[model samples]
Target: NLDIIGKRIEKIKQEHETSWHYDQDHPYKTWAYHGSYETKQTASSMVNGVVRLLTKPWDIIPMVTQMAMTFKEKVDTRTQEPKEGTKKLMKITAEWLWKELGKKKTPRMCTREEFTRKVRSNAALGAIFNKWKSAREAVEDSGFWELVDKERNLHLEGKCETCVYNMMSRAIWYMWLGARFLEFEALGFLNEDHWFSRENSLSGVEGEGLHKLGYILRDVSKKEGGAMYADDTAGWDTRITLEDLKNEEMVTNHMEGEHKKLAEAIFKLTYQNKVVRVQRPTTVMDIISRRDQRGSGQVVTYGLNTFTNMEAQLIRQMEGEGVFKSIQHLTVTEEIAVKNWLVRVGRERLSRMAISGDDCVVKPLDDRFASALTALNDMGKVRKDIQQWEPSRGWNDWTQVPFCSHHFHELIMKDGRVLVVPCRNQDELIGRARISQGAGWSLRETACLGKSYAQMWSLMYFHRRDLRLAANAICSAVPSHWVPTSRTTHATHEWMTTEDMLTVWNRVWIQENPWMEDKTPVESWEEIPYLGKREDQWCGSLIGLTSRATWAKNIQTAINQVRSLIGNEEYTDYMPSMKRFRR
Candidate 1:
C-alpha cells in the first residue's frame, strides 16, 4: 500500500502539475503530507527519500480518481441548512421533469419493490440477496456490529440530519442506474409503445431518464427528515402515511393505470432477475482458481450468492441506460461473468471500433458482443449512471464501492452486536416474516426473532460469521484516495495524520477537526459592527496565546500541537471526538 501511495503521488505531480507540495503554500489544497519531518521541507525530504529508494515515478496509484477525489472533499458542507433557494428550485425542476417524463412514456411500469420481488423469486436477484443475507449473518454471529455501532454513535452524536438522506439517496441512485440502462437497451428493443404508453418515445430522451424521478424521491425523503421510512422501517403497515410509489412523481402524465403498469414492467425486467449464473469465462476461471484466496468460497455459485448486493446496484445502473436488451435481469453465474468480461475487455474493443469509424447495430444478442460494446464505448455511453451524481443531492454523498463491504464489517466488529439496517420499502413486513420462518426460528412461527422491532430486524439481517468476510470484502474495495502525491500530498498527509485542519485541505475533512479546540473559529472571526477592537479582545484569538501575548502562550502551544498532530496518522481517533463545527 505504501509503494502504491508513493507511485500515485508521483503520478499526480508528473501528470497533473509542475510541482507538488503539502505545506500551507501549495495551490491544490487537496492532499496533506505525513511524516516525522517538520514543515514542508522535512516532510518533502522524508517522502522523497522513500520514493527514490523504494519507488519510481512511473508506478501507478492503485486508487481510483473518484475515490481519491472524495478524500479531498469534506462532508457537512452546509449541513441541514442548505442555501435558502437551492433546494426549492431543485424541487421545482424535479416535479416538472417528473410530469414531462410521464407525458412521454409508452407503457409497462412497476414499483421498485414489485420488481425486486419478482427478480428474487425468479433467481438472479434472489441469489444475490441470499448471498448478502448470508454475509450479514456471518458478520452478525461474529459480533462485528459492535464496531459498527461505535462508528455510528460517533457519526450520530453530532448533526446526523443528513445520514438518512444520504443512505436513501445512494439507494435511489442505484435504482436510477438500473432504470436508465433498461430504458435504452431492453425497453427500446421491446419498443411496443403500448407497453409503456401509446404516446411514448424512448429515442428523444438523453442520459438516465430515471434521474428526474429519483431527484423527486430524494427531495421527498429530505422533506420528511432524511428518510422515507416511518420509524426507520420500509414497512408501511404500522406507519401512518406512505409515500406512494405510484404517485404522479413516479408516473407519466398521470395516465395512472398505464404509468403503474409501466413502472411494474420495468421493475420486473430490471430488478426481478435473481441468481445470475454464467459459466466462468475460461480466462477468468483460470485466474480465480489459480490466484483466488477464498479457499472454500471459490465456487462461482457461492461468489454470486455473496455478490448480489453489488450486482443489484451494478445491474440497475446498466439497466437504467437500456443496455443488454434481452438480458435485463441477469440470471446464472455465466450471465454475470459474461457481463463482467464485457465491462473489462469489451470497453476496449468498442473504443477501437469507434477509432476506426465503424458503427455498431445493438440488438439483444449483440449488446455485449464486442462490436456493440465498441459502439457504446466509442460513444462514451458506459457508466451513464455514475455521471448523475450531482453536487447538491443524494448522489453527492460519501460512498465508495469497495469500502462499502468494509463499512458494514467494521460496524459489526466494533459494535459487538448484530446491526440490521433495513430499506424503506412498504412491503418488507411480509417478506421478512416469510424469511424468518424459512430460517427456522424456534419461537412462534408468527412471532419475529426478537422482542422489539430493532432486535427482530437485526436477527433478520445479520449473523456473526459471514458478516466478517463481507466487511473485509467491502473494505478491500474502498477506493483509498489517500495518495501521497506532492501536488495534493499536504492535505492527504494532514487528513491521514494530523488534527489542525482549520480547513481540512479544501472542504475540511468532516468538519470538527478545525474546531476541536474550546473556541469556535467562526464566532472568533466575527467582530462588532461599528465599535473599534475592544481591549478585552486579543490577536490570534483562535489560538489565543501568541508570543506577543504573555498570557496566551499555553493556548498557542495547544493550537500548534493540534495542527502538528493533524498530519500524522496517530491522530485519527482525536478527529471523531471533535464536535462538528462550521468550517
Candidate 2:
C-alpha cells in the first residue's frame, strides 16, 4: 500500500513536471498542475493550492509517510538544512504514521474527500485559508519566492516563473522550522476517529471525531506533557537532579550574587541627588461655576482635562467661606453645592413627582442623582443650607449617575431592581512579564508585599537585566507622555539623556519622587511638557543632542562603563558615534 501510494505520487509529480494541457471541458483541468526542469514558467496558478494540498496531510499512513519521505529526499538532494527539532519530529511521525495506516484498504475508514471536508469544516479554517493565500502572493511579489528557490535549489531559481510547482515542496520544509503545533494539529485531524469510524456516517453533521481531535489539539497546544495524539515527552524526564548539597550551594551562591549586584545598582540611583528632579504643579485645573461679577457672560466655565473632583469642591467651599473677596456672593452651584444636596434631598423631589402622577422618576433607595437635580433645579435649597452643612463625605454618599433620559426610568431599572451600577475596567500595570523559562506572573504582583523580599529582589534583577533595553529604546524615541505608564517588567525605569545618559529615571524610590506618592491635597504632580506639541517640534529636541559632536560619544561611553560594571568585557575599539536622530 505504501509503495502503491509512493508510485501514484511519482506519476503525478512526473506528469505535473512534463505536461502542458489546459481545457475547460476536462474534469480535473482546474486542479491540473504542470512542472518541468530548466524552465521558468511551467505551471498554472492553481498549482500552488494543489502543491499545498500535497504537502498538507490529506490521508494518514501511506500519504503522510510519502510526504515526509519526499520532504526528506528534497532536503538531502538540495543540501537544505532544516531545524533539528523539526527534522526529528517529522522523521518520528512519518515512521509512526507508516506503521498505523496498515497494508490493505479497510472498510471501516471514510474516503480522503470525506475526511478533508469534515475536518476543514469543523476547524472553521477560513482565516487560515485567507492568510495562507495572501501570504503566498505577498511573498512572491516581495522576491521572497526567488530567495527561497535559490536557497532550496528547486530548479526554479532566479527564473521568471509566475507559478513554480516545486515552490510547494520548498514551502513544506520552511513550515517545519518552528511550527510544531500546526503539524501536530494537521496530523491529529487526519487520524481522527469520528471521521473514519464505520459506524459513523455523515460525520460532518453528527460527528464526535472532529470534537475529539479538537480536544487533542488543544491539549497538545498546552505546555509540558505531550502532543494530543502522541507523547512528545518521550525523553524529557531523563535529566539528572542535583542531590549533593555542595553543588546546590554553589549554584545558589552564584545566582544570589548576581541578583544582589543588580538590586544595588537599581536602588542606589533611586535617591534624590543621584538624578535631576522635575517639580510638579500644585494647582489642579478645575471647573468653577460662579456668577460673572458684572452679570454679562456665560455663568458656567469648563476647565481643562486635568481637573479633579476634590479640587473643584474645595475651591467652591473656600469661595462660599468668603476667602476670595470678589466672589463673596458667588455660590458653587454645580459641583459642590448641587451634587452634595442631591444625595440628601433627592427623595423629597422624587416624592413630589410621584404625587403629580409623574411616575417617570425611579426613586433610588438613596438620593444620589435625584437630589442633585433638585438642588440644581432650585439652588436656593442647597446654598441656603451650605453655611450649616458639614464638610464630611464618605463611601455611603457615593452613587453612580446613569446618562439616560429622565422620563425613561425603566432604562435604569427592571424587575424592581436598580440596573445602573457604576463599572470600570481593570487596570493591569504590568500586563504580562516573562520571569522564568517555564512560567511567571505579572511584575505588579511580584513587586507587591504579598511576595517575599528575595522574590522581589530576583524579579527586579531579571527586569533590569532582560527587559530594560526595550524600555530605553522607547524612551529614546518618544516623550514621557507617549510612553505607556504601565509596567510589565518592573516598578520603575531609567531614561537616557544627552549629557548624562542615565540622568532621568521614573517611579523609583517613591518617597524621594514625591510626585509619585499620593497625598490628601495632591501636593506634587508631574507635568507633561510634550503632551500637545507637534511631531516635528517634539522630534527636534533630539536633533543636536544625538549628533556625534554633541552627545553621541558621551552616551556611548557611559553605556560602555555600565556594561563593564555589569561584568561584560570592555570594548577594544571606541564606541561608534551617532548622526542626528531619526524618527
Candidate 3:
C-alpha cells in the first residue's frame, strides 16, 4: 500500500496495534509516572493534559518508550545467573515478544484506548492491592512480631510503632527478594535474551531499586498500612508470632547452613571457591547500625537498612540479661557500662517494636514501642547510655554498615513511616564466618572467609578449623562493631573482619602452652614471658609482632601436630567458588 505519512502511520498502527511510537491512536507525553494497570493511558493522559497545559492539540510532549532512552541506557538489569526460575520465564516471554514484534511485525495487541484502559484498569489495581495484602501478610508471618511481644514483656528499650514499622519494612524486603526469584518472569524490566549478563541482570535495577522499594513501601503503607491490619502502627503488620519469627529466621539460618553446605559441596564438586561466586550474595560489614552513628548524623532507611534490628534483639538476650555479660564488651567493672549500649538498646528497642501494635494486642504489656522508648529515654537520661559511658571499652561500630539504599537521598526522608535495616542474612553475630555456593551454605571459621590472598592465608593458617580463629581473622581484617552470625549470604558478597586475631590467638596460646604447666610459662621460659598486651594497637598491630614472631616456631610445631590430626581434606573443598558465582 503506497500510502502518505499519515496513512503509513495509521496503517502500521491499525495492523500492528501496538508500538511505543507516534500515531493517531498513540499520543506521546512526559510526566511523573503515577501508575495503574494501563500505564500507557496514564502516560497518554499525562501527555494530553500537559499539552493542554503548555501547548495546543498538535503540540506534543514528545514522550513514550522511544524518547525515554534514558531508562534503556540506564541499565538492563535482568540477568538469569543466580535465578534460573525467573530467568527461564523471562526467556519464554522474550521469545514471545521477539516473535510478536520483530518477526510477525504484527501489532502486539491493543488499541490506544485499549492500552489506556489497561493502565487504568483493575488489572494493576488488583496487583497493587494483592501486593499490599501480601506485604502485610508477610510481616504478620514474620517472627519479629513475636520478639516484640517478648521485648514488651521484659521491658526492653526503644520499641514502638516506629520500630514495628521498621521490622515490617524488613519483612517486605524479604518478600521482595522472594518475589525476585520466585516471580522473575513478571519482572517489568526483563524479557530475557542474554539474561545472566550485566545488561540483563534482575538483581540490578534501573537505578536504586531499594530506594524505590522504600518509597513504595512508605506510600503503600500510608495508603494500605491501615488496611493491612486492623491497626498498622508498624509498616507491614501481618501479626505473626515470636514462634513464627523464629521459624522464618530459622529458614534463613537453614539457608546459611545450606550456604556452608553449598560451599563445601561446590568445593567438592569443582575444587574452587576462587573460581565460583556463591549463587547468593552477602555483606562485607557483617553487622552494624544507624544508632551507632547517630551523633555523626547517619539516618535510618527502610526495612533492615535502618537498624541492625535482629542483632539488637540477640544482644539483649545474650548480653543484657546478664547471661553473656561476662562474655566481653558488656560491663567494664561494676560501676560503668561499656560500649555495648547501642547493641543493648538496639536489641531492646527492636524487641519492643516487634511486639508493639495490634499484632500484640493480646499482650497489651508488650503491644507497643512505648516501653522500649521509655526505657531508652530513661537510660539516656541517667547517663550517656552505654556508648558514651566508656567509649574506649566497647566497639565503635559506625563505619561498619553495609552499602544500603537508606544512605541515598531518595530513601533518606525522615517521613517516620519508613524504616531501614540490613538484610536479615547480612545481620549476624559479633563473630561468625561462612561461605556459600550458588545453592549451598558453609559456616566455616572466618580465616577461610578471605577477600585477598593475605587474608585468605591468615584464615587458612589460623581460622580454617576454628570459629574463634576465624572470628579473629575477621576482626583483624575489618572493624569492631561488626559481629558474625548464621545468616550470611545474599545476592552479592563482600568480605569483613569480626575479632582481634592476635589477641584471640595469644589467649589461646597462653591457655595451652606445652612449655607451661598452666600458661605460667616455665621458669625457664624467658622468651615466652613477654607475650605483650593483647589490647589496643598491640592486639592488631605487628607491634608485639616480635613476641608473636618469636613464638611462631613453637606455634608452627603445634600447628603441624594439629594438621596431622586433622588430615588433608583440602580446605578449598569447603569454601565458595566466587568465579562460578560470577558466571
Candidate 4:
C-alpha cells in the first residue's frame, strides 16, 4: 500500500511538473473526502482528498517545504533555520495517516462519527478552553470539586468533566505538531499510545524564538542517558550547564588566565556622544480634521500587521509634562509649558452614544471615505460616464453580501474600523519616507551593534592568536536590527554603495593609527596598513542571536564577510560552505 501511494505521488508530481491540471474538474470529485474511524468509509475517499489538495494545482506542499529548508525566515526581525522536528513529524503523519486509513477500512471498534468528532472537536474546543485547562491543573492537586459536582443537578464539573477537560488539554499539547486520532483518542480507552507522558510539546511553535538556545548551546549526536538536557530546548540538549551561568563572568575572563591574552580580549560596544539640538522648520503644509462625527470613531489597528499601541504608548512615555499639544509632527527645539502635562487633567470632552438615540453625524476620517460608499459613488460615476454608449453595470469588492448582513450599522461600526495602517497597499512606505523627509523620531539605532570587522582587521595585522580567538567566540554584546534578510547566501545581494572607498580608508587610517591603545606604533605596528578594505566593510552584522555565533565563527574561519551594509545580486562564488555553523 505504501509503495502504491508512493507511485501515485510520483505520477502526480510528474503530472504537476508538466501539465498542471489540478482544478475542480478532478476525476474523483464525489469521492474526494470523508474522514472518520468507521469501516464503512472508504480509504480511497481519504486518499482522494489529499490527491485533490495536491493536484488542486495549489502546489503549496513542496513550495512550503522548500521554504522551511531555507532556515532563514522571520521569527520577527531575526533568523530561524530549518525546522527539522516539525519536518520529521510531517513525515510521520504521512505514514501514519496512510496506515490508519487502511486500518479504518477493516475496523469496527472506532466509529466514523466518533473518529471525526475527536479530531474536529479537540482541534476547535482545545485551544479555546485553555482558560478552563488552567482551572484543572490548578485544582487537580487540591481535590474535592468531586464532592461539589454531586451537589449540582445538571453538571458541576465532576470526574467526567475533569477527565474530558484533561483529555482535551493533553490532546492539544500532543497533537499540536500532529494528531493521533486513530491509535489513541478514537475510543478513549487505555491504549498503549495513550500518551502517558501527557507532554506539552508545542515548542514547535518557537519558530525563531529559541534563537538564543540555538546559540551558545551545543547539540551533539548522543547524550549519556539517551535523553536531552531538557524538553524545554524543544527536544534537544544544550551542553551548557547551570554552573556555566553561575560562574559565567565572561568567556574572555575564563580563557585569559589559561592562555596569554584571554582576559583582555573581551570587548564592548558603546553609544557615541549625542550633541546636536537645532531646529529646521518647514511651513509647507497644514493638517485638517473632520469637524463632525464628534470624536466618535477610531483608527483601525492590527495585532500582527502593525504595532500602533506600542508606538503610541512608548512615544507617550518620552514626552515630559507639556500642554496637550494637538499637532502631527514636532521640531527639534520646542518650548513647553511649565506645569507637567502628566498631572494635568486629560482632555475630557468625553461622550458616548448608548440606548437613547441622539442626533448625530457619521463620516470617515479626513482624507478617507467609507469603503462601500466610496465604491458606490464610483459605481455611479462610472455608470454615468458609460451612459453615452447606453448603460452597463459592474461589481467590485462588495459583490457577495451574506444573507443576513447589511451596511445599516456601517455608519457607526466601519467608520470606527475602515482602515488606518501601514500600506493597505505597497507604495505607502515609500511615500512615508519621502513625506517625512527624515523628520520626527526614529528608533533605528536601538540595536545598533555589529562585529566591527574593520576594527577586528586593524588589530588582525597586530595579533594573530587573539584575533582568531575573539573572532571564533560568540559576540552577543552588539545588538542587530537588520540581519537575516540582508544575507546574500541566495546568491549575489545586489551590492551598491554610496560611500567613497579610498577617501574614507585614508580618513580611518589617520584617525585610528596603530598601537594607539597601549603600545607605540613604532614598536608594535607593521610599516603601514596591511591592505585597505572598503570603508563600509566595518563588521559582520549580528542580526539574530544565532547570527552572532555564526558570524563570529565565520570571521575567524576566513568566511566571506562582505555583509558590510546589506544584498540581491548573486555570487555563487561565495558559498556559505566556507564555514556553515561549525563548533
Candidate 5:
C-alpha cells in the first residue's frame, strides 16, 4: 500500500524538474499525491454531509450551515415540532458521525430495582431475595470487608495517595460491590444486575481510588448496617437504604480485625513511621463539627455523565472551593509483558546521580520517592488486570492491583511545573489541583495552560489509538521539514505556528469544499509548485469516495478503504532516511 503512494510521489518527481517540495505549512503536504483529471465537482451532496466527520479529527473544518444547530436551538426557534422524522434524522446523523470518528457511546443502565421489578411478580422475587440474603450474610461474616479496609489503610500508609491507591481503592470497592450482584447470579436468580446498573456501577466505582485518596475518615458509626428483611426467614420484604451500605460503623467493623492487622503488618518491609491519617485542613473554616462534617464534602459524580445546568452550577461552586477534590464515589493480563516500562524509564532518569564539578548534588531516594515509584509500578499492573477483569469472580481477586484507565490530567502549576492528577473529568482535575493551594501548601498555583477547551480536546483527538496508528503510517511516507544547514539531522515535529495552523485548516477546507474548483492552490502553495495538481487529485479521490452509490453505504468504510489502499507508514525514519535530502 505504501509502495503505491510512494510511486505516485516518485513519478511526479521524475516527470517534473521542480518536484512538489514538502511544506511544514500545509497539512496535506505530509502525504504524497499526484495529478488526476477528476475534480471536486464529482462529489455528491452526501459527501458534503461527511466532510465534517473527516475534518472533525483535525483541529479545524468548515462549519455546516446554521440549519445544523443543536436540538435546543431548534427548540428555541420553534420553527417546527420535533417529530419522529426529526428523531430519525438526528439518530442517523449521530450514528454516522460517531462511526466516522470512531467515538464510542454506551447506554445508561437501568436501576437495580427497575430491573428486578421488570423480571417477576413481588411474590416470586421474594424467594430469590432470600437466597441472596443468606449469601450476603455468609460473605459478610467471612470478614472480607475488614481485610479490604486494612489493605486500603496500608495502601495509604505506603504514601499511595498520588499513585496506585486511587486506582486500587475503586477496584476493591467494585469487587465488594459486585459480590452483592454475584450472589444473585449464584442463587440462580435470572438477573440484569450483571448487565446494567451493576456494570455502570462498576465503571463508576472503579476510579474512586484516585479521587478518594486524600479523604479524611472523620468517624466510624456504631450502627450495624446490612440489608434487613421484614420477614428474615422468608426474605418477604427486603430493603437497603444508601445509608445502610455507607454506614461508617458498619464499614469500619468490617475493615478492621485480627486478620487485617496481621496481614497489614506482614506487608510492611521497613519500619512503619508513617500513619495513614488523612491531612485535615489547617483550621476549620466551616461552622460544622467534625462529626457533622463526616462525608459532608464528598461529591458523587459519574464518568461520561453530563451535569444539568443547576447541577453544574452547584458543583462548579463546590469545585471552586476544592470540596470535590476529596470525592469518594461508591462509585492486567499484560503482566506477562515488561510491566511499568514508563515508570522504570522515569525512575531510571530521575534516580541517576548528578555531579557538579566535585560537589555531589543527588537527592536521597527516600520512602516517599520509593512509595511513589512502587505505587506507579503497581498502578500499571492494576490497570492491565482490570482490562481483563471479570465480575463473576467478584471478591476472590479483589486485592489484585487495579488501574485507572482514565487519562492523567496534566495540571500546570504556577511554579512552571506540571503535576499529573488522575481524574475522570476536567472539572474534578481542576478542583483537585485547586485544592493543593492555601495554607503552607503550594501544589497548584493556577491553571497555567491557557489553551481553550477545544484546543485541549484536540490533544485527545490527535492522541486517539486508531488515529495514532494511521498517523504513524502516513508520516512514515513523508519527509520532514528541510533546512540547508550544517550537522542537524532531521526537522523536529515542533508545535505548529499560527500561520502553519491556518495553512492546515485552509488545506482541509479547500479539499472538502466541493465548490472550490480553481486549479490554482492557495498562495502558500507557491513554495511548492507541484502542490496545486497534487492537492486537486487528493481532493478528487476523497470526493470520489463519497459520490453516487458509495455515499449511500458506510462513509467511514469508504474512507478506511481508501486509507488501506495507500498505507503511508508513520514518518519515524528521520536523519538516516532523510540523508537523501541533506546538503
Candidate 6:
C-alpha cells in the first residue's frame, strides 16, 4: 500500500516543494514550502487513495507506529542483513504475543449501544463505505460525466443557445471536488488522532521517552475542527434554537469532545471568519410556522403540520407587506448566495421555492392561514383587530401604527404601564413568556391580548420573559419615554401576566381612557411605540452579540467563502439569485 502511495506521491511531483531539516535535538524539524495551486493538487491525490472502499488498512499506521518505536535506538547504527533464523525468531514471538493478546477478552461489547452508536461515528472514517459519496461519485451521480450530452444535443438542433448550466461547470466543479475534501479532511483528522494518541502520547502510554508536543495538538484540532462533526449522541448540538433562528442567526455546530476541539479550530479559520453561511436563512413566514415533530425522535419540520388556510393566507399577506418580518429583522440585505447555502442544506431549515412553494403545506391544509390572513387586515385592508388606540390620553408613545415593521405589538403607556395587545379576534398570539411568580413559557405557551376584559381575559401574553419586572416597574411608573424595550433596560432589568400588569394599568393609567374598568383595557388594541432612534434603543430584539445585522453582515463572509469556493464571475454573485417565485 505504501509502495503504491509512494509511487503516486512521487509520480505527481518528485518536486522540491518540501524537505525535512531534521535535528537530533529538535522535534519540530519537519517543515515545507510550496507552490500551493499544485500544492492542494498533490494533497487530494494522496487522500484520493484513501476515501474508497478498496482499502481497509485503517490499522496500518498503528502497526507501523509500534514497529518504529520498537526499532528505535535498539538497532545497530550500521547493521548487516539478519540471518534467516534471526528474522524467523522475531516473527515467531510476534505471532506468540498476537495469540496471547487474542487469548484475553476485552469486553468489546458490554453494551448493545455501540452497535448503533459506533456506526455513525465510524462513518466519518468511511463515508462512502456507508453510502455517502465521494466527490467523484457525487459528481457522476449529479450527471457531470454526461453534462455535455445536452450541450451537443442543443448543437444538433441547430440552435445558438448558450447552454449556461454545463458551461458553468468549471467554476463550480471545484465545489463538488472540494466537498469530498470536507470528508477527506475528516479522515485526515481521524488518522491524526491515531498518530496523536501515540506520538508524544507514545504508543498509548504517557511516558518520558516520547517528545511531548503542544504545537501538534493545536495543529490537529485546527484541521479536525474544519469538519462540522458529531457522533450519534450529540448531533442536536448543530441545531439553532427557534428564537435564534427566528432572530435569523445561522446555526453553528455545538460540538463536544475532540470533535468540538477540532470544530472550534476550523470554525473561524477563513478570511471569512464569522463568514457568511452558504446556507439559506429561515424564511419570515417559516419562522411563524416552524414546529417540532416528535414520533421516533424530535426533528425540525418547517411547518405547524396542520395549520389552517386562514393562517396560511395570513402569512402570505404578512409576507407581502414588509410589515411582518422577523421580530429581529435587520439591515442584512446584501444578496446572500453562500449565506443561504448552509441553511438550505441542513434539515433544520426547509427553504421555500427549492422547487415549489406549496410543498410545506403538507397537503390537506387548514384555515388557520386564512384567519391570520384576515385578522391582520380586516377585509384584507385596515387593521380592525389591532385596535385604534384612543388618540387622546397623552399617548405619543406610538406614532407608527398597525402597519409598522414591528410585528410584535408592545408599548409603554402614559404612565409606563406596558401594553402588548392580544389581537383577540384577528389571531391567537402563540409562544410563551414568564410570569414573575415563578412561571416562564417557551415555544409551547399560548396567549392573546387586547384592551377589552373579554380580550383581557385572553390577555395571557407576557412581553417580559419574567413578568415580575412589570410588578416591580408597575408601581414606579416613570411614563413612556424612559422605558426599555420589552426585554429590559438600563442594562439592568424586568414579566408579565395579565392581572398583575392590569393592576398598574387599571390603577395608574385610568384617567383619560377609563373604559377598561370592566376588568380590561381601554382599547382592544392600542397604539404601540416606534423603535425610537438608534441610540434611543427602541429595539432590543435586534441588538446583541448575535444580533440580527451582525448575523447578516457575517452571513456574507461565509457565503462569500462559498461564493469564492464555488467560483463565479457574475460580479454581483455576492448572493445567488433566490426568492425564486414572487407570487
Which candidate's TM-score is highest? 3
Which parts of model 6 have CA positions greater than 4 angstroms off?
1-250, 270-319, 324-583
TM-score of each: 0.17, 0.15, 0.19, 0.14, 0.16, 0.15
Better candidate number, 4 or 5, judged by TM-score:
5
Q: How close is candidate 1 to the true structure, as a TM-score?
A: 0.17
> Model 5: how far is 47 from its true place, Å?
42
Whole-model alpha-carbon lDDT for candidate 4: 0.19
**Model 3 lDDT, residue 283, Cα:** 10
What are the per-residue Cα lDDT tens digits for candidate 2 across 1-583?
Answer: 2221223234444544554332223222212222212222211111111112211212232422333331323211211122332222222222322222222222131233443443333321111221235232422243543443332231112111111111122221012111111212222222343222212211111122211222222222232321111101111111101111111112112223333232222112111001110111221111111110100000000000001111122222223332333321323443344344434532232221111000011222222222222211111112222332433121221122111111111111112211111111101111112111112333223222112211221212212211122123212222222222211221022321122222221222122332233422212111101111232123121223223133332443434343343233322221111112221
Model 1 spans > 4 angstroms off: 1-88, 111-583
What is candidate 1's CA lDDT for residue 39? 16
- What's the true lDDT of residue 439 in model 5? 29
Error of 1 at 403 (Å): 25
Model 5 scores a TM of 0.16
**Is candidate 1 or 2 superior in lDDT?**
1
Measured on C-alpha atoms, candidate 3 has an lDDT of 0.22
Tens-digit lDDT track of model 6 for 1-583: 2221222233223333353222233211111111111111100111111011111122233431232231212110121223332222222222322232223212111111322243332322111212335422433343532433342343233221111100010011012222223212322322222211222211121111101111112222232111111001111111212221211111112223433332222221210111110111220000000111010000011111111111222233232333233322222441132223223421111111110111111101122222232222221122222333211111112222211112224445544554433221111111111111112422111111101112122222233211211112211221111212121101001112334344433443343232233333444112212222342223222233333334334433433442343243332321121121111
Please report, in order, the local distance difference test score of every candidate based on alpha carbons.
Answer: 0.23, 0.22, 0.22, 0.19, 0.22, 0.22
The segments of candidate 4 whose C-alpha lies over 4 angstroms from its true place after superposition are 1-136, 142-583
Off by over 4 Å in 3: 1-182, 186-430, 434-562, 569-583
Error in Å for residue 324 of model 6:
6.0
- lDDT string for model 1 (388-474, tens) is 222111211211101111111112222132121212221222122122213322222111121122122222222221121111111
> Per-residue alpha-carbon lDDT of model 3 for 1-583, expressed as tens digits?
1111222123323443442232232111211111111111100111112111111111221322123222211111111121222222222222332232223221121122332343332121111122325322433344533543443332222111111001112221111212121112111111222222112221112222221322322222232111111111222222121221222122112223323232222112111100100011211100101111011000001111111222222222223334322321223241123223333442222222221111210011121211222211211111122342321122112112122312111111122121221221111211111222122323222223222222322322221112222222223332233234322221221122434333333333344223224443222211221212342122132223444344322332333332343344332211111122123
Q: Rank the candidates by TM-score, best first.
A: 3, 1, 5, 6, 2, 4
Residue 298 accuracy (lDDT) in model 6:
9
C-alpha RMSD by candidate, in order: 29.8, 35.8, 30.3, 35.1, 33.2, 32.5
